[PDB]
Design a protein around this motif. Structure first.
Motif, short mmCIF file in Angstrom:
data_model
loop_
_atom_site.label_atom_id
_atom_site.label_comp_id
_atom_site.label_asym_id
_atom_site.label_seq_id
_atom_site.Cartn_x
_atom_site.Cartn_y
_atom_site.Cartn_z
N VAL A 165 43.99 50.74 39.20
CA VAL A 165 44.53 49.45 38.77
C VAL A 165 44.42 49.26 37.25
O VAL A 165 45.39 48.92 36.59
N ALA A 166 43.24 49.49 36.70
CA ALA A 166 43.06 49.34 35.25
C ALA A 166 43.94 50.32 34.45
O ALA A 166 44.60 49.93 33.49
N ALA A 167 43.97 51.59 34.86
CA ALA A 167 44.77 52.58 34.15
C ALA A 167 46.22 52.15 34.11
O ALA A 167 46.84 52.15 33.05
N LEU A 168 46.76 51.78 35.27
CA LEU A 168 48.19 51.51 35.39
C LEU A 168 48.62 50.09 35.01
O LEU A 168 49.64 49.91 34.34
N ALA A 169 47.87 49.09 35.46
CA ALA A 169 48.23 47.70 35.22
C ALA A 169 47.80 47.24 33.83
O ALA A 169 48.37 46.29 33.29
N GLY A 170 46.81 47.90 33.25
CA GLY A 170 46.33 47.50 31.93
C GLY A 170 45.49 46.24 32.02
O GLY A 170 45.33 45.51 31.04
N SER A 171 44.93 45.98 33.19
CA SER A 171 44.03 44.85 33.37
C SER A 171 42.63 45.22 32.91
O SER A 171 42.37 46.37 32.54
N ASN A 172 41.71 44.26 32.95
CA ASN A 172 40.33 44.53 32.57
C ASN A 172 39.50 45.11 33.71
O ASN A 172 39.72 44.78 34.88
N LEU A 173 38.54 45.97 33.37
CA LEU A 173 37.58 46.46 34.35
C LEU A 173 36.74 45.31 34.90
O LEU A 173 36.51 44.29 34.23
N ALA A 174 36.25 45.49 36.13
CA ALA A 174 35.48 44.47 36.85
C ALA A 174 34.47 43.65 36.02
O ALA A 174 34.46 42.42 36.08
N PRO A 175 33.61 44.34 35.23
CA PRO A 175 32.58 43.62 34.45
C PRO A 175 33.15 42.57 33.50
O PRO A 175 32.46 41.61 33.17
N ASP A 176 34.39 42.77 33.07
CA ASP A 176 35.03 41.87 32.12
C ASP A 176 35.99 40.89 32.79
O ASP A 176 36.61 40.07 32.12
N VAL A 177 36.11 40.97 34.11
CA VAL A 177 37.08 40.15 34.82
C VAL A 177 36.59 38.72 35.07
O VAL A 177 35.42 38.50 35.41
N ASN A 178 37.51 37.77 34.90
CA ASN A 178 37.28 36.35 35.12
C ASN A 178 38.53 35.74 35.74
O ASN A 178 39.52 36.44 35.96
N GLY A 179 38.50 34.44 36.00
CA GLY A 179 39.71 33.69 36.29
C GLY A 179 40.19 33.69 37.73
O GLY A 179 41.25 33.15 38.05
#
Lengths: 339, 319
Positions: free
Chosen positions: B223-237
């Motif tokens: 997910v992070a590689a492809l979507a460009g989202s943040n890794l779990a530790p940095d995830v919020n919202g």
């Protein structure tokens, strides 16, 4: 005891022996080397279930015209991103690696592609392919089905294959490499127990009647449990259905040709490649995150958190040094076949 | 203090609350339906309990009432989506609608989504695809709540994956999180606990030991590689109404008619499993999706249970 005895040998010696046997069957030298590397890598990485114990059956299938020694498979692009491969009874790794070469070419345009393989022989250890994709800087997802060997969660009949999935993901240096059977154990490993007269832990298998058994010979005729209970069953079954639907291979109960030298190999395999560069993420950020995980608080200080692929790499490095241990009966078998 | 209500009453109440905030009718029904389907299937953790938080996120601009996202075809089968802070279900269904159009040409497509709100129950999307005669694979990341196998720090998201496969009749629908249980556990100190409150600031174990950990991590990475989202530790919202959602989502669609196989042969095979020898004659082998359907039919007949506080809060909002 003879059937419980081991020998340790230099990898190069076993590789050379394996290649010569394949070549005696008309298998091209590059292909012979590749099929041999698959089994040797399994041995080196501590997965003897997918190592050299697999060879005599392939040799037999070749001799009997059930395996095709030269074909590299025949692929057709059914859609822009979908390669349908008829294995033509070819050796698994030869057909898989060719499919990878062909599908990889298309990725520059498509970003995502799939090869669905039928009529190919046993693939051996799927980590090999996942790793190859990852080393080429690609994301590689690999699946293969088998003879019905695994019972559903809540059931006691063999109806599902061992159905491994492997996932390779580029990291900085060493790639993330996941490879797991959706069964709690391999049948290959159970066979190794049966072979050596060893009991098997309770919970691995039930006998042909569906009764829990610690007898490996009973287990052989029985059914293996899924790993992770209903969830692992869910996953194994998903794999079963995806492979059949896309590869057009047979469902487990109709599958043969992997553990016998009588019938066509009629299981299926799927390879999905993805170009990370099409994505919006960062491979180097992946690396730093994995390092973080390795250094994170361990349950046991002596045993640091590992990333999938660490163990295999550590085992490979040690066996290349100290050699491969294989059962003496197997070594004598190959040796007889050599002569 | 519980109560039981007709699903239609809950749907109507949810839709009104959404529309109040400028969500178009169809998007409001969809978002509503995501929560209702979760309630009907006995997954209240992804149900109307989540609704107050989303309403607050909409009122703060952390959720955008109108956007369906902005997608860009990076490659022939690869759609990159900027969710633009849209509602999860709205952005996801639009990506499904968009990638579906290309399948006749490509046979396969993936949508990589960032900057979207919580997706709710992934089974919803897997089933949608499967009912369209499509194979659907969906995954999503989240706040770090899961520790690695052999580790005690929360570093990995619950990372669900759903897989829908058409099956001439009732589709195969698998939905599974990679943690053992939903928010057994340690921490905050990394110490095994049987205390819920301590678990809450703790870290949940992966299912299936090393293997389940491997799968959850693979999901995290893909997910992070492809979507460009943040890794779990940095995830919020996702669990709060103060930060922009920065987890990611993947959708893979595959057209089975591109394959060499046979959906009808899949259905007979699943039936054969349902009819196989059970461990217990009273509890037959079930196919993923079976329990959810049965629960749904039951609940549609007896109504939905939910805490009176929740309902009183929501009803006060609709008024």
């Amino acid at each position: 005891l003879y059937f419980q005895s081991m020998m340790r040998l230099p990898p190069a010696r076993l590789r050379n022996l394996s290649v010569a046997l394949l070549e005696k069957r008309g298998v091209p030298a590059d292909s012979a080397r590749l099929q041999a590397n698959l089994l040797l890598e399994a041995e080196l990485r501590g997965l003897p279930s997918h190592g050299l114990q697999r060879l005599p059956l392939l040799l037999s299938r070749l001799d009997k015209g059930l395996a095709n020694p030269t074909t590299r498979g025949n692929g057709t692009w059914r859609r822009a991103s979908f390669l349908s491969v008829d294995g033509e009874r070819g050796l698994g790794p030869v057909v898989m690696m060719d499919a990878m070469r062909v599908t990889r070419r298309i990725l520059k345009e498509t970003g995502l592609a799939i090869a669905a393989i039928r009529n190919a022989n046993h693939m051996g250890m799927l980590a090999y392919y996942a790793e190859a994709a990852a080393r080429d800087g690609l994301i590689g997802i690999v699946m293969s089905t088998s003879e019905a060997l695994v019972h559903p969660f809540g059931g006691t009949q063999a109806l599902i294959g061992t159905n491994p999935v492997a996932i390779g993901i580029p990291a900085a240096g060493h790639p993330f490499v996941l490879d797991l059977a959706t069964s709690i154990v391999s049948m290959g490993k159970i066979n190794n127990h049966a072979m050596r007269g060893l009991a098997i832990p309770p919970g691995w298998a039930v006998d042909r009647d569906g009764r829990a058994t610690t007898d490996p010979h009973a287990a052989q005729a029985g059914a293996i449990a899924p790993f992770g209970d209903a969830k692992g069953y869910g996953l194994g079954l998903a794999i079963e259905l995806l492979v059949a639907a896309l590869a057009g291979s047979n469902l487990a109960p109709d599958v043969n040709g992997t553990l016998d030298d009588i019938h066509p190999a009629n299981k299926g395999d799927l390879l999905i490649l993805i170009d990370p560069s099409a994505g919006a993420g960062s491979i180097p950020a992946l690396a730093a995150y994995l390092d973080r995980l390795r250094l994170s608080r361990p349950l046991d200080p002596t045993q640091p958190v590992a990333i999938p692929g660490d163990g295999a790499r550590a085992r490979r490095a040690a066996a290349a040094k100290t050699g491969i241990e294989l059962p003496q009966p197997l070594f004598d078998h190959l040796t007889a076949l050599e002569a």
